[PDB]
Amino acid sequence: ELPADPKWELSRARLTLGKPLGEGCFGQVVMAEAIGIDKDRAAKPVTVAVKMLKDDATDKDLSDLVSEMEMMKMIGKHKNIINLLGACTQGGPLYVLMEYAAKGNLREFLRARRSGEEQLTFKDLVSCAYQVARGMEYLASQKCIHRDLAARNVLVTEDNVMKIADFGLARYKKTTNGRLPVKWMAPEALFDRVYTHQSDVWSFGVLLWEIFTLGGSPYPGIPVEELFKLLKEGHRMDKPANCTHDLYMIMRECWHAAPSQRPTFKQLVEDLDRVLTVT
Ligand SMILES: *CCC(=O)N1C[C@@H](n2nc(C#Cc3cc4ncn(C5CC5)c4cc3Cl)c(C(N)=O)c2NC)C[C@@H]1COC
Secondary structure (H helix, E strand, C coil), X not given: CCCCCHHHECCHHHEEEEEEXXXXXXXXXXXXXXXXXXXXXXXXXXXXXXXXXXXXXXXXXXXXXXXXXXXXXXXXXXXXXXXXXXXXXXXXXCEEEEECCCCCEHHHHHHHCCCCCCCCXXXXXXXXXXXXXXXXXXXXXXXXXXXXXXXXXXXXXXXXXXXXXXXXXXXXXXXXXXXXXXXXXCHHHHHHCCCCHHHHHHHHHHHHHHHXXXXXXXXXXXXXXXXXXXXXXXXXXXXXCCCCHHHHHHHHHHCCXXXXXXXXXXXXXXXXXXXXXXX
C-alpha cells in the first residue's frame, strides 16, 4: 500500500477511465475524465491522460511509476512540459493524472499539416521550436536531462501548445521500436554513455530538423552501422528543403562535436525569439 500525499490526491469518484491513448510509447496510458481538476469550474469534467500499471505488473513496475510521479512533483510546473495534475494512490490501483494533449505527438501533428487549410506557416514552425526550447530551458534549470529529446516525445495540446513528455523517466542500437533512437543521440552519449544538458542540445538540433522537414525521419536511407562512421567523419544532415540559412546554422551549432561549443537552452531560446521577431 502507498503513502498518501493529500495535496495531489484525487477522489476515485471524480475519475472515469476511457480509451487507450496510442500503444505503449509512454507506457500503459488511457484517456480519462476528471471532475473538478479545473479550479474555476468545479463541476466540469476535464479530459486528462492517466498512466497506470498492467494487470500483471511487477513490484519493480510499481516502484518505477511511483518514482516517476515523485520526480514530476520535484521538477515542478511549466507551460511547455506535460504536467502532473493528480493521483489516485489509496483504495485501488495507482493512477497518475497528466495533462492531455489532444493533437498527439509533434511528428504526427506536422506530417498531417504538410498540405491544405491547416498547412503550417514558417512562423508556426519557429514558434513550435521556440516552445520546445523554453520547456527544455526549464528542465535544464531544474537539473533534468531528458536523454531522448525527439518530436515523438513532444505533445501538442488542443490550443497548439508544445509540451515535452517522457522527461522524468529512469533509463540494441540496431533494433527499432518503429524508430531508431540512436539518430537523436549525441556522439558522446552514443559512444561513451555520457549524458549532459549539452547532449540534449544535440537532440534538439535533430528535433529542429524534424520540425523544418514537417515530421521527416532523420538520416534518410542511412543504416545505423554507417551512421557511426559518418558522425565520426564530421558529416551532418543537409539543410531541410525550404529552411532558412539562420535556422540551419542553429541546427549546425547544436551538432558541434565538442559539447561546450554547442549553445545552451537559454541561448537557443534567445536565438529562436530573435528569429520570431524578425520573421
Ligand atoms: C504510441 C503512442 C503514440 O504514438 N501516441 C500516444 C499519444 N499520447 N501519449 C500521451 C502521453 C503521456 C505521458 C507522458 C509522460 N511523460 C512522463 N510520464 C510519466 C509520469 C512520469 C508520462 C506519462 C504519460 Cl501518460 C498523451 C497525452 N498525455 O495526452 C497522448 N495523447 C494523444 C500521442 C501519440 C499519438 O500521436 C498521434
